Amino acid sequence: SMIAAYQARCQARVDAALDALFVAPREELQRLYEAMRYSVMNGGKRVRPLLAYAACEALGGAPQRADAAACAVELIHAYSLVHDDLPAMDDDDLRRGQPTTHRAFDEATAILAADGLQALAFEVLADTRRNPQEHAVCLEMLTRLARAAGSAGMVGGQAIDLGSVALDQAALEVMHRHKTGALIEASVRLGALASGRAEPASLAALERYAEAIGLAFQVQDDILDVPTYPALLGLEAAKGYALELRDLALAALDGFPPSADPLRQLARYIVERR
Amino acid sequence: SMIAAYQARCQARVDAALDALFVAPREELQRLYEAMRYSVMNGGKRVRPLLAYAACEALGGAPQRADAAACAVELIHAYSLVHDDLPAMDDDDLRRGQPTTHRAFDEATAILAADGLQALAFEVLADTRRNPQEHAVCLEMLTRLARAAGSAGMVGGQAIDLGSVALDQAALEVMHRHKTGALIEASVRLGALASGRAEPASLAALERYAEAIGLAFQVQDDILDVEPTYPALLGLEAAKGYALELRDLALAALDGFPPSADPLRQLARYIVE
Ligand SMILES: CC(C)=CCC/C(C)=C/COP(=O)(O)OP(=O)(O)O
Ligand SMILES: O=C(O)CCn1c(=O)oc2ccccc21
Ligand SMILES: O=C(O)CCn1c(=O)oc2ccccc21
Ligand SMILES: [Mg+2]
Ligand SMILES: [Mg+2]
Ligand SMILES: [Mg+2]
Ligand SMILES: [Mg+2]
Ligand SMILES: [Mg+2]
Ligand SMILES: [Mg+2]
Ligand SMILES: [Mg+2]
Numbered sequence A: 001s002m003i004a005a006y007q008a009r010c011q012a013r014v015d016a017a018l019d020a021l022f023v024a025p026r027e028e029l030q031r032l033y034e035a036m037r038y039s040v041m042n043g044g045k046r047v048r049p050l051l052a053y054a055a056c057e058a059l060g061g062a063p064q065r066a067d068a069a070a071c072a073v074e075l076i077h078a079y080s081l082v083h084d085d086l087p088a089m090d091d092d093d094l095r096r097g098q099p100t101t102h103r104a105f106d107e108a109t110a111i112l113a114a115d116g117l118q119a120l121a122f123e124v125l126a127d128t129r130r131n132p133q134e135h136a137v138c139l140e141m142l143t144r145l146a147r148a149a150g151s152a153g154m155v156g157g158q159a160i161d162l163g164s165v166a167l168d169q170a171a172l173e174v175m176h177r178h179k180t181g182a183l184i185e186a187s188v189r190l191g192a193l194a195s196g197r198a199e200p201a202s203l204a205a206l207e208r209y210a211e212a213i214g215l216a217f218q219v220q221d222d223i224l225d226v227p228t229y230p231a232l233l234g235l236e237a238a239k240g241y242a243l244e245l246r247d248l249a250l251a252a253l254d255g256f257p258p259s260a261d262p263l264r265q266l267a268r269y270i271v272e273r274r
Numbered sequence B: 001s002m003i004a005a006y007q008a009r010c011q012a013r014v015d016a017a018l019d020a021l022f023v024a025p026r027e028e029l030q031r032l033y034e035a036m037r038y039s040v041m042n043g044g045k046r047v048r049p050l051l052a053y054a055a056c057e058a059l060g061g062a063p064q065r066a067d068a069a070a071c072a073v074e075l076i077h078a079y080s081l082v083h084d085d086l087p088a089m090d091d092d093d094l095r096r097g098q099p100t101t102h103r104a105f106d107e108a109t110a111i112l113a114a115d116g117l118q119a120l121a122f123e124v125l126a127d128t129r130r131n132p133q134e135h136a137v138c139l140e141m142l143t144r145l146a147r148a149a150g151s152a153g154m155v156g157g158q159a160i161d162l163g164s165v166a167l168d169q170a171a172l173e174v175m176h177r178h179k180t181g182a183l184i185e186a187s188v189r190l191g192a193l194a195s196g197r198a199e200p201a202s203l204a205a206l207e208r209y210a211e212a213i214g215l216a217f218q219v220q221d222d223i224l225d226v227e228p229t230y231p232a233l234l235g236l237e238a239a240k241g242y243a244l245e246l247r248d249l250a251l252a253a254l255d256g257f258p259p260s261a262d263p264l265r266q267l268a269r270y271i272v273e
Helices: A003-019 A027-040 A047-058 A063-085 A107-126 A135-149 A154-163 A169-194 A200-225 A229-233 A235-252 A258-272 B002-019 B027-040 B047-058 B063-085 B107-126 B135-149 B154-163 B169-194 B200-226 B230-234 B236-253 B259-271
Strands: none
Touching: A003 A047, A003 A063, A003 A258, A027 A063, A027 A107, A027 B154, A047 A063, A047 A169, A047 A200, A047 A258, A063 A107, A063 A135, A063 A154, A063 A169, A063 B107, A107 A135, A107 B063, A107 B107, A107 B135, A107 B154, A135 A154, A135 A169, A135 B107, A135 B135, A154 A169, A154 B027, A154 B107, A169 A200, A169 A229, A200 A229, A200 A235, A200 A258, A229 A235, A235 A258, B002 B047, B002 B063, B002 B259, B027 B063, B027 B107, B047 B063, B047 B169, B047 B200, B047 B259, B063 B107, B063 B135, B063 B154, B063 B169, B107 B135, B135 B154, B135 B169, B154 B169, B169 B200, B169 B230, B200 B230, B200 B236, B200 B259, B230 B236, B236 B259
16 A cells, blocks of 8 residues: 555645745744744644545545645644643643643743634635635635534534543544544545535545544544543454444445545555554 | 614624524533633624624625624634633633633633634635625635734734733834734725625725724723823823824725715724713
C-alpha cells in the first residue's frame, strides 16, 4: 500500500497552503500570528486534509480543487486541540511531546489564537479566489463545516465527553460521532463538493464511509492503548468490530472507480496499524 | 426617542430570532445549549443588530432582509464577551449584576458555548433560507464577517490589548479599531449588503460612517465613566470635543443619503449624548 506516500503528499500540499495564511497584516499582530502558526504547523499528520483530497479524487476531481477544503478542516481541527489542551479542559502541558500553545505563549493568547483559527477556516471557504467553486457549492461547504464544527457537531461532542460519566457502547458512539465523527464526515463531504461532481447517492456513500472510518479509528486506538471498546466488548471482540467497521467503509465505496483507492487504503491502514 | 423606538424594535426582532437558535438537538447537549442561550439572551441592547438593520434601510432595503446579518453579528459579539470574561482574560465574575457564563456554569462550558456561538454566526449567514440573498452576496457577507471577527480584526484587537506600556492616542486608536471597530464596520457592511441595493460608493460612505461611530462609542464610554483613556490622554474637555467631531464625521458620511438613513443619523447623535 502507498497510503504513507499519499499521506505525505497531502501533508506537504496542505502545509504549504496553511503556512501562507499566518502572515500578520501589521506588526502589532505578529505574536498572535506566531501563536496561530505554532498551533497549526506542528508536524501533524493531516488526516482531515487527506480525506478532503481523497474524496475529491474519488469523484474524479483534480485534488487542487480541494485545497481550501483541506485548509479549513485542518484549521478547525487545530483550533479544537488548542482549546482542548487548556487548563479548564484537559490541562495538557504537551501535545505530541512539544509544549502546548498556552505554555509556549500564554493562556489568553492560546484562547485567542484558536478563536482566530476558527474564523480563518470560514474565511478560507468563503474566499472565492482561494476556494473557486461555484457559489452555491462554496455556501454548501460553509454550511456543512459550520454545522459540523459547532454545538451540534464537534463542540457538542466535546461537551458530551466532558459531561459523561459508565457509558454503554451506544453512548460512547454518540460521543465519538460528535467529537470526531462530525469533522471527519465534513472533511469527506467538503472534498466531494470540491470535485464539482458530487451527487446525492455518492455523497451518501461517502458519508457512510466517513462514519465507519471515524469509529474505526477510535476502536483501534483503544485496542492499541491496551470505558473503552476493549472494556465494553472484550479485547478480541473489539478487534473484530474494527474489522467490521473497515468492511463497512469499503462496502460504502463499492462501485466507485479506482480513483477511490486512497480512501480504501486509508480504511485498511486505520485497522492495520500496530 | 425616535432612536429609542428604533432600538427597541431592532432589539425585539433580533431577540426573537436569536432565542430560536438555542434548542439542543438532543438531550446530551441540553446544558451546552443552555450555556449558549445564557450567553446571548442577557438583555443586551443589540447595537450591532441595530446597525445592520439601519444600514439596510439606509440603502432602501426592507429591514427583515438583514435578519441573518443582525443575528450573526450579535453571535460574534456574544461569543467574544464570553471569552473575554474568562479567568485568563479579564476574569470577570459579573456583567450587569449577573454571573458571567463561566461563573454560572463552569469554565470549560463557557469556552465551548462561545466556540459554538462563533460557528453558529457563520452557519446563519451561509444558510440561504435564513439569509436569502444572492449567493455572491451571502459569500461577501461571510467573507467580511470572518475577516472582521478574526485575527486581523476583533481577535487581533484583543491580542493588541494584551500586548499593550503607555499607549499614545494613535496606538490606543489602532487597538480600538481592531477590538471593536472591525465588528461595528462589519455590522454596517452586512446590513448594507442585505439591502440588495449596495454599490461601491454607498458602501464606502457607510464605512466612513461606521469608522466614526465605532470610535465615538469608545470616546463617549470613557467620558461617561468619568461623568489609558480618552480623558486621561486629552483631558475631559478635549475628549468631549473629539466625540462631537466624530459625530460630525459620521453625519457628513451620510451626505446625500435619503430620509431612510435617518436612523443612522439619529444614532450618531444619540451616542454623544
Ligand atoms: C470543541 C473542542 C475544544 C473540541 C476538541 C475535540 C477533540 C478531538 C479533542 C481531543 O480529544 P482528546 O482530549 O480525547 O484527545 P487528545 O489525546 O488529542 O487530547
Ligand atoms: O508515520 C507516518 O509518517 C505515516 C503513517 N501513516 C501512513 O502510512 O498512512 C497514514 C494515513 C494517515 C495518518 C498517518 C499515516
Ligand atoms: O434606554 C435604553 O434601554 C435604550 C437607550 N437607547 C436609545 O434610546 O437608543 C439606543 C441606541 C443604541 C443603544 C441604546 C439605545
Ligand atoms: Mg479532551
Ligand atoms: Mg485532550
Ligand atoms: Mg478511546
Ligand atoms: Mg477586556
Ligand atoms: Mg470585563
Ligand atoms: Mg464585571
Ligand atoms: Mg474605554
